[PDB]
Assembly symmetry: D2
Homo-oligomer: 485 residues x 4
């Protein structure tokens, strides 16, 4: 694996001739992304990001394209990789590399290292390409991360440099841990302070997802978070909309492309009843399913029951579930003993961030046979029972891998939050300690207001007398810091 170069842009993607079809959907997506457009207009002259060099780990989709060309429209230089092996949309990747005014032959866009259907080896390769800038004296000075793989690579790789050695891996280290480490080990043979120099260059990380943000909270508590981080996941306009309303749209997209299995009349098991779970269950309900949920949190559980859902354990429900979805951000939800209890031709998929919510490592060692139906749809048969399980996306996130992820309108919230967070960490950089921060409420409202307008919502303006009575400014913020919406 070696990068390609064309008119001064280095990259690796499926197919550069997909740019026209890429660019077509870019423009449509832009009508569906008023958050990002409004920010381009608000920030064109200002150039808030001049001097920013952004390293991005984020699903290389159409919506991430519009995100990228917003970031560059505010002065940033970017380099990009997907944060999932299947989530790349090749046509969006190509329009990124070509740019709005370039061609396949003479691309005038940004470096992108991503294509749909990476191996774990090429993924980690593309991840290192995105963090590695041409001139050794101006490395990445900023990170846009989703999952924390960009962040994790930087900080473990500094830890290994500062310790002196990149460690061995045993056996029951995941196949990815090997690959991950393999990358850093070889890197060390030739380069003794690569990551350390990146880590002091980087002003901040902004992190998109619940999981990445969890990893962030564990670096801060170790003492190992080297630069500030905005938790973008926990914008109100991120979680309460993307995680939930995004998934309500995209779960069922993922399952329809995978399987064309009817949803109505079916027993559907959702594991997890957070924002993602709530989105899944709502979607399944709307479609006529008989939805049951799992949960470890008594509160989240009380909500599911108040929404008409049984609250049940995997063990109790698994043998009779027609569709099983894991949505927990946790590992070990569907183990092999579960998969063997499942019914013939039941569907099994994961919509959390990682491929370990489902025992894929166990299923591959089990003596089941895999028959590939088509991209990202696999049919697994146990010979002892005769029963087959349809597995979506090798247990990686079915929505981004079997479909196209959330809709443009949803990501317009998420990526508008992401843009803002980068501006703030870049322009107001000494205003931050080495901690996880969340955006101010005024800015959450800013973003919400763009989409209410875009949708045709008519807001009531508080009178002077009304805002004295509520103790708030007419123009926001409207709620206490602990308001949960």
């Amino acid at each position: 694996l070696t990068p390609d170069v064309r008119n001064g842009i280095d990259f690796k993607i499926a197919d550069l001739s997909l740019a026209d079809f890429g660019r077509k959907e870019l423009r449509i997506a832009e009508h569906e992304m008023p958050g990002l457009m409004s920010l381009r207009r608000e920030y064109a002259e200002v150039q808030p990001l001049k001097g920013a060099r952004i390293s991005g780990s984020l699903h290389m989709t159409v919506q991430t394209a519009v995100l990228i060309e917003t970031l560059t429209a505010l002065g940033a230089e970017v380099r990009w990789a997907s944060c999932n092996i299947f989530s790349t949309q090749d046509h969006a990747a190509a329009a990124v590399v070509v740019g709005p005014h370039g061609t396949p032959d003479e691309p005038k866009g940004v470096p992108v290292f991503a294509w749909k259907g990476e191996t774990l080896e090429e993924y980690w390769w593309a991840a290192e390409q995105m963090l590695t800038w041409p001139d050794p004296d101006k490395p990445a000075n900023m990170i846009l991360d989703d999952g924390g793989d960009a962040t994790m690579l930087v900080l473990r790789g500094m830890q290994y440099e500062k310790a002196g050695v990149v460690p061995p891996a045993e056996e029951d280290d995941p196949a990815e841990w090997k690959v991950f480490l393999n990358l850093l080990r070889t890197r060390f043979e030739t380069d003794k302070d690569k990551w350390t120099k990146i880590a002091e260059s980087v002003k901040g990380v902004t992190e998109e997802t619940t999981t990445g943000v969890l990893r962030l909270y564990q670096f801060a508590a170790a003492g190992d978070l080297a630069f500030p981080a905005i938790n973008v996941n926990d914008s109100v306009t991120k979680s309460k909309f993307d995680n939930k309303y995004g998934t309500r749209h995209s779960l069922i997209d993922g399952i329809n492309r995978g399987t064309d299995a009817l949803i109505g009349g079916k027993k559907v098991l959702i594991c997890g009843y957070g924002d993602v779970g709530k989105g899944c269950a709502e979607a399944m309900k709307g479609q006529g399913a008989r939805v049951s949920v799992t949960e470890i949190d008594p509160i989240n559980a009380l909500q599911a029951m108040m929404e008409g859902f049984d609250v049940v354990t995997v063990e109790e429900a698994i043998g009779d579930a027609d569709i099983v979805v894991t949505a927990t951000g946790n590992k070990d939800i569907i183990m092999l003993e579960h998969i063997k209890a499942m019914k013939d031709h039941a569907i099994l998929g994961n919509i959390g961030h990682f491929d370990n919510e489902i025992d894929m490592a166990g299923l591959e060692r089990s003596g089941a046979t895999r028959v590939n139906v088509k991209p990202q749809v696999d049919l697994w048969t146990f010979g002892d029972t005769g029963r087959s399980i349809i597995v979506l996306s090798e247990g990686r996130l079915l929505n981004l891998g079997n479909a196209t992820g959330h809709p443009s309108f949803v990501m317009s919230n998420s990526f508008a939050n992401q843009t803002i967070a980068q501006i703030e960490l870049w322009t107001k950089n000494d205003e931050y300690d080495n901690e996880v921060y969340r955006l101010p409420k005024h800015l959450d409202e800013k973003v919400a207001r763009i989409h209410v307008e875009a949708l045709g919502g008519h807001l009531t303006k508080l009178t002077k007398e009304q805002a004295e009575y509520l103790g708030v400014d007419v123009e926001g913020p409207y709620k206490p810091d602990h308001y949960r919406y």
Copy 2:
């Protein structure tokens, strides 16, 4: 255009080498179509359809492939074509020509003339193939229709022969009407009684949708119904299930693939509140759209309202609609006036059985400029306003054009009913006069019973005093003839 023959089988399709992919999904499909699988088992011995030569005009999909292969398992010969130029699933076309035990080099299935993306001319050519059996002495003897296109062809065809002329088409007749006429006319040159003979030979037609059944009721009212017809659309297990629940599923699949636009938050306009309209609104609603309905029938109108929908006219509503779907079975729902009024990048599609629900002819002659984004998605632009519209499937049923149609489990009801009507008309032709029939309630109940059973429902059994209180047999039909479900 001429047939391909390979191993004694004529056919014309996209690509024969897709038979294994088709086969895999067909086999998956059999696990989701207990209705068809169960009639295969019941009637394997009997071979109820021996001597049948069935010409089938029905969307060449995986679910049809399973119907087709149900009929051949019961001893019928078939010749097949799609009832729509975009509806064919080519991997399934391949699967049926190859057969369950053939390969592409040695195919062992049946004649299929169908591919996704036919032209009108090719559509009519394909259809003639399907109705024209190899042996002049052994013409088609059954028609299995969906939309009445095969029925119309035999009957206008015969009509023109008894007339000794095929009418010249008027200079402003629709493109398809000219094609249709030109096909018949070209044939009257070399074969003067082809269609009359076929019509003498055909013992029955089974009709699967509302539009087509209308046309039967029109041939009958004219005295021009030359054979018995079973109205399969209006089996309870068909209309109340396929038309409603099918659409609830396949509509948003159609939209997610064609456009990937967020439904939640959007103003959705659904023209028509028949079963298909009911299904669309249910679908949109569950997904968070703000749904308004149009209707001409105050009964269906009041139902919408009672379901939480504004009942509005296209004129008052079109300006505001983010997504516009026609679901009427009628022509001229959305004229060029209406399209020129839609907001920028609004979406327009038709899920009714033909493409005159939208004014595609007016849109094609308008002067607007077309840009194909990808198959079955076109962005139309008007110079005088600068507004562009996303048109799905060129006004053709969008669930099948832009997606896969209804799921297997749904189609199992419809096709079990079609299978049953085929058997009835074939084995008992004498019991039927030249009229349009519906199947007895007890058969509808049979099909229902199989699917409840498949999903895990537990039916209650009437005691003897109960059954006598209700005036019904414990097993027997359970509801009066006028019962509306």
Copy 3:
């Protein structure tokens, strides 16, 4: 001895006539919510289509019924009225009907009414005979307006025993209402001999409002026993697809909220039956956050319950887990004593069918379980052997009208428009009807539906000349074939 009251020439038996002014206020509000009936008063005001009609009505004595009663009188008809349930009467509504739009309690101008909330079985049948029995033996009732067939049954059985020349004895183990019904007939026979025979001869037609009563008319007609014409009012599309469904969706949870104040959200709800009423039931409970399961004997209804997100289960497997149990079948013997004894502590048990035989009320009353009345129509039963108590609504009689008010005015507007349309048809075109069971014609259902679309603010599209041609329909309707199921 129960005897009627007479004030100002108007005989009646009701709770309290001082309730008229209240009743009247609510009736007036109710007219705003019943455009169906209101438009019918307007359209038929000078044609007086019901002059000479003497209508005996057996239908819940509610605010909505009162508006129907006065629609019929606005149109020339005379009436005598009883409720078709011992708990369904709204006493202030009863009051206002006897008083009239312009009467007072001391100077009543209304019509005869025999109904109060909390009747006994014997009072119910007495009230029923009072309603059926017009003042002049030479001017008997000539029309029946029925809900559940009790009037029609009283007459048709009443005549069939006369002829038989005697009224049977009842068995040790006959239902208590049967012994009562029989004792009424047998007692009148000792004095009168052709009372019901002459009445059944006088009646020009019956209009039946509900599913249960229509089964009974099908069962009279099949036996050669239907002796005047019938219109099945239930199977108007505007009736069944609207009242039975959307109506029950309103009034089911009303009944439960009044009866119990139990949170519906998070609870397991067993709905027996998935006809239009079961569908209304499950809809209503689903939207309140309930965990809904359904029982059914019919695979079509059952396949719909499943496609709507509901398990289809037997009472046997379901009963131990359900927090609220609602019967909605039209059938007998749905929740037996073994079933009730299996219910969890303080689960709620309700019937929303037309008769109380859906729940084993006789069985439970002879079980040995102790009864404590909580309040009007909420009773708490205790089994000594398990220590479990169950909350029984309306002593097993329809719970929406027993524990609440029934369906809203807007919903009844549709049903009552249809019945009013039927009465007029059967009265003025009596000639063309045979002694069969009839349904209204589509254009009339459409008429009803249109008033209500109009009232609600909805805009109907009008077919062009080409669309109507293309569909083979007149522009002005009817819009659908005869078998169309909506």
Copy 4:
């Protein structure tokens, strides 16, 4: 007005003979209130509240009665008054004064000063009764508040005492403001530090509603909150269940009792989209209504739109609404002006905490005539238009004025949180300063867990390795502090 006494207990209630009906519904409520019931068992022997003298201002309902008897079962002494003029359940007041073991003759319960249909004069007299403990050396040491009127009475009272003047009222002050001061000024003529000594005696207040809480925030802000407060409202188990799921149940109850107008098919207008408004909107949706929402907060607005609801202004939507419901906790939502614009027989009510969301004061001055239909249902007519409006509960909260408020199972959450806040503020009292606190997550989850098992919900237990993965204890808390559920 002077209180009654009987067997040592002073009270002013409607009718003591209602105690039997009172007590039967109490025992049924207890089966619907596992939170309260688990706290009676947990804390029976520990007697945590001994020495607590709790002044209760909260809706005198069946549910509040099971709360009270939990408090007394835990050692507290209490005096009670309702916090709304119509919300008292006369028979719950009775069973409370009688106790489980007394008779109407010899009551063995607690002091209550509450009945349905108090005048403003009577409401305030009763609040003072409730706060004025019989021994001067043992005044109130605890307040349990809903709406902040008890808190207001105590801290304004004291403030006027420290200033030597209860300030003369202005000729057209809100009628309620005049009654407030008349009560103070009159006590002040004879008692110059009644409230000062009461404020110095109260160790803390536990506040139950969003609106009470607001006021608490405006005491702290001014430096005037002279004891610790607990925000009970903002336990997850309170706001996300009571405000939301409570209202979903009770809104429609109050409407059905008051009016028995069909909800399906009607245009409903919900002002405000917080927890209450989401509750209302949810409820009206399920019943079939064509619901529109008003809002000032774009985040809340974007939720309503994602949820199938137009966001609109009163002005735009008022002439067309069938049912208008304000859920804002703000003032001046519906003015006389909007009221005059309402359609004939439109229904109008308020479900926020005070009456002034609707311009009641201006309605009464308008020249509209009031006809009382029955308790809490009034018909108002404008002679100049001839149109009438049904106003519910004189614009006081309609669920508790026209019905019975939230059901037992919902209030089991609120009142378990309340009982816990009372234990904590009382037993661990020194650990608290004169600020507004919120209970710790682990306590919320504790309350949630009781109700989930009561409902038959089966929680999943995290493995050691699962807990370690998430960095949480197997027994919780499971979420960070900013988690919004």
